[PDB]
Amino acid sequence: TPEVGELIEKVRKAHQETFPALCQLGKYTTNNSSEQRVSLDIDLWDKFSELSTKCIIKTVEFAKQLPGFTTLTIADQITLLKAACLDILILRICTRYTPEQDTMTFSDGLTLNRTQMHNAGFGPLTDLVFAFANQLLPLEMDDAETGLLSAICLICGDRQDLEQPDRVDMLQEPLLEALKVYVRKRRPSRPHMFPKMLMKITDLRSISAKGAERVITLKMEIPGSMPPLIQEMLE
Ligand SMILES: CC(C)(C)c1cccc(-c2cc(-c3ccc(C(=O)O)cc3)nn2-c2ccc(S(C)(=O)=O)cc2)c1
């Protein structure tokens, strides 16, 4: 379909322009607590929170390129971004997972193993985030699919305090339709692929809810090392 093809192309381009892929980056490592579990490696947390600020900027750039996002009220654009920020950041870091080395790669090439991701701040959430990354791999998702899943996660009408939830639901409707027809065309062998992918958003919300609780825990324990929160940055 030309209207569907055009929508897929726009979302694939919005994602590619705001997300450097694992293959494109020059991986580098750090010796910082690489083989020792610690409650919090402040040097790892410092690098990690600086990378997060840059990634939140890219997410906002991605959101603004989604057809119709900027037509929503400013209050609703802020509400959607605050609610999906952790979900999108989780999806982005899990997209750069290397299973044999059990590492994830940041947008500047920084490559941390499971112990280091735990020490950088993930703590009790590490195994859940790494399990999600492991579940993504067999889906063999391309840029169009990752972009569309990110857009579906963002443009969600069930978020608390939305001024126009039906409008947001209507904006989400062509994205779901595009992903359905796209996965059908590209993978006709597996017709269960589309609901398997939407199930990942359900998994993402659960992990994101736990993540928000960890943000609060970290704000309590290390307030002086906390960068401005997601809510603070987007406002
Ligand atoms: C457990 C917990 C640690 C809370 C957590 C939970 C879920 C997601 C994150 C998270 C992922 C990224 C990220 C950074 C860079 C890239 C890139 O380079 O591709 C990709 C992703 N950042 N990030 C994050 C969020 C808030 C904050 S905070 C408290 O607001 O300081 C700091 C960091 C973190």
Coordinates of N, CA and C and ligand atoms in Angstrom, one line a residue:
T1 N 0.8 -1.2 0.0 CA 0.0 0.0 0.0 C 0.9 1.3 0.0
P2 N 0.6 2.3 -0.9 CA 1.5 3.5 -0.9 C 1.4 4.3 0.4
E3 N 0.3 4.5 1.0 CA 0.1 5.3 2.3 C 0.8 4.5 3.4
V4 N 0.7 3.2 3.4 CA 1.4 2.4 4.5 C 2.9 2.4 4.2
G5 N 3.3 2.2 3.0 CA 4.7 2.2 2.6 C 5.4 3.5 3.0
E6 N 4.7 4.6 2.7 CA 5.2 6.0 3.1 C 5.3 6.1 4.6
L7 N 4.4 5.6 5.4 CA 4.4 5.7 6.8 C 5.6 4.9 7.4
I8 N 5.8 3.6 6.9 CA 6.9 2.7 7.2 C 8.2 3.4 7.0
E9 N 8.4 4.0 5.8 CA 9.6 4.7 5.4 C 10.0 5.9 6.3
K10 N 8.9 6.7 6.7 CA 9.1 7.8 7.6 C 9.6 7.4 9.0
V11 N 9.0 6.3 9.6 CA 9.3 5.8 10.9 C 10.7 5.1 10.9
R12 N 11.0 4.3 9.8 CA 12.3 3.7 9.7 C 13.3 4.8 9.6
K13 N 13.1 5.9 8.8 CA 14.1 7.0 8.7 C 14.3 7.7 10.0
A14 N 13.2 8.0 10.7 CA 13.2 8.7 12.1 C 14.0 7.9 13.1
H15 N 13.9 6.6 13.0 CA 14.7 5.7 13.9 C 16.1 5.6 13.5
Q16 N 16.4 5.4 12.2 CA 17.8 5.3 11.8 C 18.6 6.6 12.0
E17 N 18.0 7.8 11.7 CA 18.6 9.1 11.9 C 18.9 9.4 13.4
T18 N 18.3 8.7 14.3 CA 18.4 9.0 15.7 C 19.1 7.9 16.5
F19 N 19.5 6.8 15.8 CA 20.0 5.6 16.5 C 21.2 5.0 15.7
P20 N 22.4 5.2 16.2 CA 23.5 4.5 15.5 C 23.5 3.0 15.8
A21 N 23.6 2.1 14.8 CA 23.5 0.7 15.0 C 24.8 0.1 15.6
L22 N 24.7 -1.0 16.3 CA 25.9 -1.7 16.9 C 27.1 -1.9 15.8
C23 N 26.8 -2.3 14.6 CA 27.8 -2.5 13.6 C 28.5 -1.2 13.2
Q24 N 27.9 -0.1 13.3 CA 28.4 1.2 13.0 C 29.4 1.8 14.0
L25 N 29.3 1.4 15.2 CA 30.1 1.9 16.3 C 31.4 1.3 16.5
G26 N 32.4 2.0 17.0 CA 33.7 1.6 17.4 C 33.7 1.2 18.8
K27 N 33.5 -0.1 19.1 CA 33.4 -0.6 20.5 C 34.6 -0.4 21.3
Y28 N 34.5 0.1 22.5 CA 35.6 0.2 23.5 C 35.1 -0.2 24.8
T29 N 36.0 -0.7 25.7 CA 35.7 -1.2 27.0 C 36.3 -0.4 28.1
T30 N 36.0 -0.7 29.3 CA 36.6 -0.1 30.5 C 36.9 -1.2 31.5
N31 N 38.0 -1.0 32.3 CA 38.4 -1.9 33.3 C 37.6 -1.8 34.6
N32 N 36.9 -0.6 34.8 CA 36.1 -0.3 36.0 C 35.2 -1.4 36.4
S33 N 35.4 -2.0 37.6 CA 34.7 -3.1 38.2 C 34.2 -4.1 37.2
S34 N 35.0 -4.5 36.3 CA 34.6 -5.4 35.2 C 34.3 -6.9 35.7
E35 N 35.0 -7.3 36.8 CA 34.8 -8.6 37.4 C 34.4 -8.7 38.8
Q36 N 34.0 -7.5 39.4 CA 33.6 -7.4 40.8 C 32.2 -6.7 40.8
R37 N 31.2 -7.4 41.5 CA 29.9 -6.8 41.7 C 30.0 -5.8 42.8
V38 N 29.5 -4.6 42.6 CA 29.4 -3.5 43.6 C 28.0 -2.9 43.6
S39 N 27.6 -2.3 44.7 CA 26.3 -1.6 44.8 C 26.2 -0.5 43.8
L40 N 27.3 0.3 43.6 CA 27.3 1.4 42.6 C 28.7 1.9 42.4
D41 N 29.1 1.8 41.1 CA 30.4 2.3 40.6 C 30.1 3.7 40.1
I42 N 30.4 4.7 40.9 CA 30.1 6.1 40.6 C 30.7 6.6 39.3
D43 N 31.8 6.1 38.9 CA 32.5 6.4 37.6 C 31.7 5.8 36.4
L44 N 31.2 4.6 36.6 CA 30.3 4.0 35.6 C 29.0 4.7 35.5
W45 N 28.4 5.0 36.7 CA 27.1 5.8 36.8 C 27.3 7.2 36.1
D46 N 28.5 7.9 36.3 CA 28.7 9.2 35.7 C 28.8 9.1 34.2
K47 N 29.4 8.1 33.6 CA 29.5 7.9 32.1 C 28.1 7.6 31.6
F48 N 27.4 6.6 32.3 CA 26.1 6.1 32.0 C 25.0 7.3 32.0
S49 N 25.0 8.1 33.0 CA 24.0 9.2 33.1 C 24.3 10.3 32.0
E50 N 25.5 10.5 31.6 CA 25.9 11.5 30.6 C 25.4 10.9 29.2
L51 N 25.6 9.6 29.0 CA 25.1 9.0 27.8 C 23.6 9.0 27.7
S52 N 22.9 8.9 28.9 CA 21.5 8.9 29.0 C 20.9 10.3 28.5
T53 N 21.5 11.4 29.0 CA 21.1 12.7 28.6 C 21.1 12.9 27.1
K54 N 22.1 12.4 26.4 CA 22.3 12.5 24.9 C 21.2 11.6 24.2
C55 N 20.9 10.4 24.8 CA 20.0 9.5 24.3 C 18.5 10.0 24.4
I56 N 18.2 10.7 25.5 CA 16.9 11.3 25.8 C 16.7 12.4 24.7
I57 N 17.7 13.2 24.4 CA 17.7 14.2 23.3 C 17.3 13.5 22.0
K58 N 18.0 12.4 21.6 CA 17.7 11.6 20.4 C 16.3 11.1 20.4
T59 N 15.8 10.6 21.5 CA 14.4 10.1 21.6 C 13.3 11.2 21.3
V60 N 13.6 12.4 21.8 CA 12.7 13.6 21.5 C 12.7 13.9 20.0
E61 N 13.9 13.8 19.4 CA 14.1 14.1 18.0 C 13.4 13.0 17.2
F62 N 13.4 11.8 17.6 CA 12.7 10.7 17.0 C 11.2 10.9 17.1
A63 N 10.7 11.3 18.3 CA 9.3 11.5 18.5 C 8.7 12.7 17.6
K64 N 9.5 13.8 17.5 CA 9.1 14.9 16.6 C 9.0 14.6 15.1
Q65 N 9.7 13.5 14.7 CA 9.7 13.1 13.3 C 8.6 12.1 13.0
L66 N 7.9 11.6 14.0 CA 6.8 10.7 13.8 C 5.6 11.4 13.2
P67 N 4.9 11.0 12.1 CA 3.8 11.7 11.6 C 2.7 12.0 12.6
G68 N 2.4 13.2 12.7 CA 1.3 13.7 13.6 C 1.7 13.9 15.1
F69 N 2.9 13.5 15.5 CA 3.2 13.7 16.9 C 3.1 15.2 17.3
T70 N 3.7 16.1 16.5 CA 3.7 17.5 16.8 C 2.4 18.2 16.6
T71 N 1.3 17.5 16.2 CA -0.1 18.0 16.0 C -0.8 17.8 17.4
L72 N -0.3 16.9 18.2 CA -0.9 16.7 19.6 C -0.6 18.0 20.4
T73 N -1.3 18.2 21.5 CA -1.1 19.3 22.3 C 0.3 19.1 23.0
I74 N 1.0 20.3 23.3 CA 2.4 20.2 23.9 C 2.3 19.5 25.3
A75 N 1.2 19.6 26.0 CA 1.0 18.9 27.3 C 1.0 17.4 27.0
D76 N 0.2 17.0 25.9 CA 0.2 15.6 25.6 C 1.5 15.0 25.0
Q77 N 2.3 15.8 24.3 CA 3.6 15.4 23.8 C 4.5 15.1 25.0
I78 N 4.5 16.0 26.0 CA 5.3 15.9 27.2 C 4.9 14.7 28.0
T79 N 3.6 14.4 28.2 CA 3.1 13.3 28.9 C 3.5 12.0 28.3
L80 N 3.3 11.9 27.0 CA 3.7 10.6 26.3 C 5.2 10.4 26.4
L81 N 6.1 11.4 26.2 CA 7.5 11.3 26.3 C 8.0 10.9 27.7
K82 N 7.4 11.5 28.8 CA 7.7 11.2 30.1 C 7.4 9.7 30.4
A83 N 6.2 9.3 30.0 CA 5.7 7.9 30.2 C 6.5 6.8 29.4
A84 N 7.0 7.1 28.2 CA 7.7 6.1 27.4 C 9.2 6.2 27.4
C85 N 9.8 7.2 28.0 CA 11.2 7.5 28.0 C 12.0 6.2 28.4
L86 N 11.8 5.7 29.6 CA 12.5 4.5 30.1 C 12.3 3.3 29.2
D87 N 11.1 3.1 28.7 CA 10.7 2.0 27.7 C 11.6 2.1 26.5
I88 N 11.7 3.3 25.9 CA 12.4 3.5 24.7 C 13.9 3.3 24.9
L89 N 14.5 3.9 26.0 CA 15.9 3.8 26.4 C 16.2 2.3 26.6
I90 N 15.3 1.5 27.3 CA 15.5 0.1 27.5 C 15.6 -0.6 26.1
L91 N 14.7 -0.4 25.2 CA 14.7 -1.0 23.9 C 16.0 -0.6 23.1
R92 N 16.4 0.6 23.2 CA 17.6 1.1 22.5 C 18.9 0.4 23.0
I93 N 19.1 0.3 24.3 CA 20.3 -0.3 24.8 C 20.3 -1.9 24.5
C94 N 19.1 -2.5 24.6 CA 18.9 -3.9 24.4 C 19.1 -4.3 22.9
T95 N 18.9 -3.3 22.0 CA 19.1 -3.5 20.6 C 20.6 -3.7 20.3
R96 N 21.5 -3.2 21.2 CA 22.9 -3.4 21.0 C 23.5 -4.4 21.9
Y97 N 22.9 -5.6 22.0 CA 23.3 -6.7 22.8 C 24.2 -7.7 22.0
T98 N 25.3 -8.1 22.6 CA 26.3 -9.1 22.0 C 26.2 -10.3 22.9
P99 N 25.5 -11.4 22.6 CA 25.3 -12.5 23.5 C 26.5 -13.2 24.0
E100 N 27.5 -13.5 23.0 CA 28.7 -14.3 23.4 C 29.6 -13.6 24.4
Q101 N 29.6 -12.3 24.5 CA 30.4 -11.5 25.5 C 29.4 -11.0 26.6
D102 N 28.1 -11.2 26.4 CA 27.1 -10.7 27.4 C 27.3 -9.2 27.7
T103 N 27.4 -8.4 26.6 CA 27.6 -7.0 26.8 C 26.5 -6.2 26.1
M104 N 26.4 -4.9 26.4 CA 25.5 -3.9 25.7 C 26.4 -2.8 25.3
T105 N 26.1 -2.2 24.2 CA 26.9 -1.1 23.6 C 26.1 0.2 23.6
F106 N 26.7 1.3 24.2 CA 26.1 2.6 24.2 C 26.4 3.3 22.8
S107 N 25.6 4.4 22.6 CA 25.7 5.2 21.3 C 27.1 5.8 21.0
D108 N 28.1 5.8 22.0 CA 29.4 6.4 21.7 C 30.4 5.2 21.5
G109 N 29.9 4.0 21.6 CA 30.7 2.8 21.5 C 31.1 2.1 22.8
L110 N 30.8 2.8 23.9 CA 31.1 2.2 25.3 C 30.4 0.8 25.4
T111 N 31.1 -0.2 25.7 CA 30.6 -1.6 25.8 C 30.8 -2.1 27.1
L112 N 29.7 -2.4 27.9 CA 29.7 -2.9 29.2 C 29.2 -4.3 29.3
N113 N 29.9 -5.1 30.1 CA 29.4 -6.5 30.4 C 28.3 -6.4 31.5
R114 N 27.7 -7.6 31.8 CA 26.5 -7.7 32.7 C 26.9 -7.2 34.1
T115 N 28.1 -7.5 34.6 CA 28.6 -7.0 35.9 C 28.7 -5.5 35.9
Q116 N 29.2 -4.9 34.8 CA 29.3 -3.4 34.7 C 28.0 -2.7 34.6
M117 N 27.0 -3.3 33.8 CA 25.6 -2.7 33.7 C 25.0 -2.7 35.1
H118 N 25.2 -3.8 35.8 CA 24.7 -4.0 37.2 C 25.3 -2.9 38.1
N119 N 26.6 -2.7 38.0 CA 27.3 -1.7 38.8 C 27.1 -0.3 38.4
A120 N 26.8 0.0 37.1 CA 26.5 1.3 36.6 C 25.1 1.9 37.1
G121 N 24.3 1.0 37.7 CA 23.0 1.5 38.3 C 21.8 0.5 38.1
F122 N 21.9 -0.4 37.2 CA 20.8 -1.4 37.0 C 20.5 -2.2 38.2
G123 N 21.6 -2.6 38.9 CA 21.5 -3.4 40.2 C 20.5 -4.5 40.1
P124 N 19.4 -4.6 40.8 CA 18.5 -5.7 40.8 C 17.7 -6.0 39.5
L125 N 17.7 -4.9 38.7 CA 17.0 -5.0 37.4 C 17.8 -5.6 36.2
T126 N 19.1 -5.8 36.5 CA 20.0 -6.3 35.4 C 19.5 -7.5 34.7
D127 N 19.2 -8.6 35.4 CA 18.8 -9.8 34.8 C 17.5 -9.7 34.0
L128 N 16.6 -8.8 34.4 CA 15.3 -8.6 33.6 C 15.6 -7.9 32.3
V129 N 16.5 -6.9 32.4 CA 16.9 -6.1 31.1 C 17.7 -7.0 30.2
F130 N 18.6 -7.8 30.7 CA 19.4 -8.8 29.8 C 18.5 -9.9 29.3
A131 N 17.5 -10.4 30.1 CA 16.6 -11.4 29.6 C 15.8 -10.8 28.4
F132 N 15.3 -9.5 28.5 CA 14.6 -8.8 27.4 C 15.4 -8.8 26.1
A133 N 16.7 -8.4 26.3 CA 17.6 -8.3 25.2 C 17.7 -9.7 24.5
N134 N 17.8 -10.8 25.3 CA 17.9 -12.1 24.8 C 16.7 -12.6 24.0
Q135 N 15.5 -12.1 24.5 CA 14.2 -12.4 23.9 C 14.0 -11.7 22.5
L136 N 14.6 -10.5 22.4 CA 14.6 -9.7 21.1 C 15.3 -10.3 20.0
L137 N 16.5 -10.9 20.2 CA 17.4 -11.5 19.2 C 16.7 -12.4 18.2
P138 N 15.9 -13.5 18.6 CA 15.3 -14.4 17.6 C 14.2 -13.7 16.8
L139 N 13.7 -12.5 17.1 CA 12.7 -11.8 16.4 C 13.4 -11.2 15.1
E140 N 14.7 -11.2 15.0 CA 15.5 -10.7 13.9 C 14.9 -9.4 13.4
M141 N 14.7 -8.4 14.2 CA 14.1 -7.2 13.9 C 15.0 -6.3 13.1
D142 N 14.4 -5.6 12.1 CA 15.1 -4.6 11.3 C 14.8 -3.2 11.7
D143 N 15.4 -2.2 11.1 CA 15.2 -0.8 11.5 C 13.8 -0.3 11.4
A144 N 13.0 -0.8 10.4 CA 11.6 -0.4 10.3 C 10.8 -1.0 11.5
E145 N 11.0 -2.3 11.8 CA 10.4 -2.9 13.0 C 10.7 -2.3 14.3
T146 N 12.0 -2.0 14.6 CA 12.4 -1.4 15.8 C 11.8 0.0 16.0
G147 N 11.9 0.8 14.9 CA 11.3 2.1 14.8 C 9.8 2.1 15.1
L148 N 9.1 1.2 14.4 CA 7.6 1.0 14.6 C 7.3 0.6 16.0
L149 N 8.0 -0.3 16.6 CA 7.8 -0.7 18.0 C 8.0 0.4 19.0
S150 N 9.0 1.3 18.7 CA 9.3 2.4 19.5 C 8.2 3.4 19.4
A151 N 7.7 3.7 18.2 CA 6.6 4.6 17.9 C 5.3 4.1 18.6
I152 N 5.0 2.8 18.6 CA 3.8 2.2 19.2 C 3.8 2.4 20.7
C153 N 5.0 2.2 21.3 CA 5.3 2.3 22.7 C 5.0 3.8 23.2
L154 N 5.5 4.7 22.4 CA 5.3 6.1 22.7 C 3.9 6.6 22.5
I155 N 3.3 6.4 21.3 CA 2.0 6.9 21.0 C 0.9 6.0 21.5
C156 N 0.6 6.2 22.8 CA -0.2 5.3 23.5 C -1.3 6.1 24.3
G157 N -2.5 5.8 24.0 CA -3.6 6.6 24.6 C -4.1 6.2 26.0
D158 N -3.5 5.2 26.6 CA -3.9 4.8 27.9 C -3.0 5.5 29.0
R159 N -2.1 6.4 28.7 CA -1.2 7.1 29.6 C -2.0 8.1 30.5
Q160 N -1.8 8.0 31.8 CA -2.5 8.9 32.8 C -2.2 10.4 32.4
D161 N -3.3 11.2 32.7 CA -3.3 12.7 32.5 C -3.3 13.2 31.0
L162 N -3.6 12.3 30.0 CA -3.6 12.8 28.6 C -4.9 13.6 28.4
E163 N -4.8 14.8 27.7 CA -5.9 15.7 27.4 C -6.8 15.1 26.3
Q164 N -6.1 14.5 25.3 CA -6.9 13.9 24.2 C -6.5 12.4 23.9
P165 N -6.8 11.5 24.9 CA -6.5 10.1 24.7 C -7.0 9.4 23.4
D166 N -8.3 9.8 23.0 CA -8.8 9.2 21.7 C -8.0 9.6 20.5
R167 N -7.5 10.9 20.5 CA -6.7 11.4 19.4 C -5.3 10.6 19.3
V168 N -4.7 10.4 20.5 CA -3.5 9.6 20.6 C -3.7 8.2 20.1
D169 N -4.8 7.5 20.5 CA -5.2 6.2 20.0 C -5.3 6.1 18.5
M170 N -5.9 7.2 17.9 CA -6.2 7.3 16.5 C -4.9 7.5 15.8
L171 N -3.9 8.2 16.4 CA -2.6 8.3 15.8 C -1.8 7.0 15.9
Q172 N -2.0 6.2 16.9 CA -1.4 4.9 17.1 C -1.9 3.9 16.1
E173 N -3.2 3.9 15.7 CA -3.8 3.0 14.8 C -3.1 2.7 13.5
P174 N -2.7 3.8 12.6 CA -1.9 3.4 11.4 C -0.5 2.8 11.7
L175 N 0.1 3.0 12.9 CA 1.4 2.4 13.2 C 1.3 0.9 13.4
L176 N 0.2 0.5 14.1 CA -0.1 -0.9 14.4 C -0.4 -1.6 13.0
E177 N -1.2 -1.0 12.2 CA -1.6 -1.5 10.8 C -0.3 -1.6 10.0
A178 N 0.6 -0.6 10.0 CA 1.9 -0.6 9.2 C 2.8 -1.8 9.7
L179 N 2.9 -2.0 11.0 CA 3.8 -3.1 11.5 C 3.2 -4.5 11.1
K180 N 1.9 -4.6 11.2 CA 1.2 -5.9 10.8 C 1.5 -6.3 9.4
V181 N 1.2 -5.3 8.5 CA 1.4 -5.6 7.0 C 2.9 -5.8 6.7
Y182 N 3.8 -5.0 7.4 CA 5.2 -5.1 7.2 C 5.8 -6.4 7.6
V183 N 5.5 -6.9 8.8 CA 6.0 -8.2 9.3 C 5.4 -9.4 8.4
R184 N 4.2 -9.2 7.9 CA 3.5 -10.2 7.0 C 4.3 -10.4 5.7
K185 N 4.6 -9.2 5.1 CA 5.3 -9.2 3.8 C 6.7 -9.8 4.0
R186 N 7.5 -9.3 5.0 CA 8.9 -9.6 5.2 C 9.1 -11.1 5.8
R187 N 8.2 -11.5 6.7 CA 8.2 -12.8 7.3 C 6.9 -13.6 7.1
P188 N 6.5 -14.1 5.9 CA 5.2 -14.8 5.8 C 5.2 -16.2 6.4
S189 N 6.4 -16.8 6.6 CA 6.6 -18.1 7.2 C 6.1 -18.1 8.7
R190 N 6.3 -17.0 9.4 CA 5.9 -16.9 10.8 C 4.8 -15.9 11.0
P191 N 3.5 -16.4 10.9 CA 2.4 -15.4 11.1 C 2.1 -14.9 12.5
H192 N 2.8 -15.6 13.5 CA 2.7 -15.3 14.9 C 3.6 -14.2 15.3
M193 N 4.5 -13.7 14.4 CA 5.5 -12.7 14.6 C 4.9 -11.3 15.1
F194 N 3.8 -10.8 14.5 CA 3.2 -9.6 14.9 C 2.8 -9.6 16.3
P195 N 1.9 -10.5 16.8 CA 1.6 -10.5 18.3 C 2.8 -10.8 19.2
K196 N 3.8 -11.6 18.7 CA 5.0 -11.8 19.5 C 5.7 -10.5 19.8
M197 N 5.8 -9.6 18.7 CA 6.4 -8.3 18.8 C 5.6 -7.4 19.8
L198 N 4.3 -7.3 19.6 CA 3.5 -6.5 20.5 C 3.5 -6.9 22.0
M199 N 3.8 -8.2 22.2 CA 4.0 -8.8 23.5 C 5.2 -8.2 24.2
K200 N 6.3 -7.8 23.3 CA 7.5 -7.2 23.8 C 7.2 -5.8 24.5
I201 N 6.2 -5.1 24.0 CA 5.8 -3.8 24.5 C 5.2 -4.0 25.9
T202 N 4.4 -5.1 26.1 CA 3.9 -5.5 27.4 C 5.0 -5.8 28.4
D203 N 6.0 -6.6 27.9 CA 7.2 -6.9 28.7 C 8.0 -5.6 29.0
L204 N 8.1 -4.7 28.1 CA 8.8 -3.4 28.2 C 8.2 -2.6 29.3
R205 N 6.8 -2.5 29.3 CA 6.1 -1.7 30.4 C 6.4 -2.2 31.8
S206 N 6.4 -3.6 32.0 CA 6.7 -4.2 33.3 C 8.1 -3.8 33.7
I207 N 9.1 -3.9 32.9 CA 10.5 -3.6 33.2 C 10.6 -2.1 33.5
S208 N 9.9 -1.3 32.6 CA 10.0 0.2 32.8 C 9.4 0.6 34.1
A209 N 8.3 0.0 34.6 CA 7.6 0.3 35.9 C 8.7 0.0 37.0
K210 N 9.4 -1.1 36.9 CA 10.5 -1.5 37.9 C 11.6 -0.5 37.8
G211 N 12.0 0.0 36.6 CA 13.0 1.0 36.3 C 12.7 2.3 37.0
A212 N 11.4 2.7 36.9 CA 11.0 4.0 37.6 C 11.2 3.9 39.1
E213 N 10.9 2.7 39.7 CA 11.1 2.5 41.1 C 12.6 2.5 41.4
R214 N 13.5 2.0 40.5 CA 14.9 2.1 40.8 C 15.4 3.5 40.7
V215 N 14.9 4.3 39.7 CA 15.3 5.8 39.6 C 15.1 6.5 40.9
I216 N 13.9 6.2 41.5 CA 13.5 6.8 42.8 C 14.5 6.3 43.9
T217 N 14.8 5.0 43.9 CA 15.8 4.4 44.9 C 17.1 5.1 44.7
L218 N 17.6 5.3 43.5 CA 18.9 6.0 43.2 C 18.9 7.4 43.6
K219 N 17.8 8.1 43.4 CA 17.6 9.5 43.8 C 17.8 9.7 45.4
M220 N 17.3 8.7 46.1 CA 17.3 8.6 47.6 C 18.8 8.5 48.0
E221 N 19.5 7.4 47.5 CA 20.8 7.0 47.9 C 22.0 7.9 47.3
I222 N 21.9 8.4 46.1 CA 22.9 9.3 45.5 C 22.3 10.6 44.9
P223 N 21.7 11.5 45.7 CA 21.1 12.7 45.1 C 22.1 13.7 44.4
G224 N 23.3 13.7 45.0 CA 24.3 14.6 44.5 C 24.9 14.2 43.1
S225 N 24.8 12.9 42.8 CA 25.3 12.3 41.5 C 24.2 12.2 40.4
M226 N 22.9 12.5 40.8 CA 21.8 12.3 39.9 C 21.8 13.5 38.9
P227 N 21.7 13.1 37.6 CA 21.5 14.2 36.6 C 20.1 14.7 36.6
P228 N 19.6 15.7 35.9 CA 18.2 16.1 36.0 C 17.3 14.9 35.5
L229 N 16.2 14.6 36.3 CA 15.3 13.5 36.0 C 14.7 13.7 34.6
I230 N 14.1 12.6 34.0 CA 13.4 12.6 32.8 C 12.3 13.7 32.7
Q231 N 11.4 13.7 33.8 CA 10.4 14.6 33.9 C 10.9 16.1 33.9
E232 N 12.0 16.3 34.6 CA 12.7 17.6 34.7 C 13.2 18.1 33.4
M233 N 13.9 17.2 32.6 CA 14.5 17.4 31.3 C 13.4 17.8 30.2
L234 N 12.4 17.0 30.1 CA 11.3 17.2 29.1 C 10.4 18.4 29.3
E235 N 10.2 18.8 30.6 CA 9.5 20.0 31.0 C 10.2 21.3 30.5
Ligands
LIG1 C1 17.6 0.9 36.4 C2 17.9 2.3 35.8 C3 19.4 2.5 36.0 C4 17.2 3.3 36.7 C5 17.5 2.4 34.4 C6 16.3 1.7 34.0 C7 15.9 1.7 32.7 C8 16.6 2.4 31.7 C9 17.7 3.1 32.1 C10 18.5 3.8 31.1 C11 18.9 3.4 29.8 C12 19.7 4.4 29.3 C13 20.4 4.5 28.1 C14 21.5 5.4 28.0 C15 22.2 5.5 26.8 C16 21.8 4.7 25.7 C17 22.6 4.8 24.5 O1 23.7 5.4 24.5 O2 22.1 4.2 23.5 C18 20.7 3.9 25.8 C19 20.0 3.8 27.0 N1 19.8 5.4 30.2 N2 19.0 5.0 31.3 C20 18.8 6.0 32.3 C21 17.6 6.3 32.7 C22 17.4 7.2 33.8 C23 18.5 7.7 34.4 S1 18.3 8.8 35.8 C24 17.8 7.7 37.1 O3 17.2 9.7 35.4 O4 19.6 9.4 36.2 C25 19.8 7.3 34.1 C26 20.0 6.4 33.0 C27 18.2 3.1 33.4

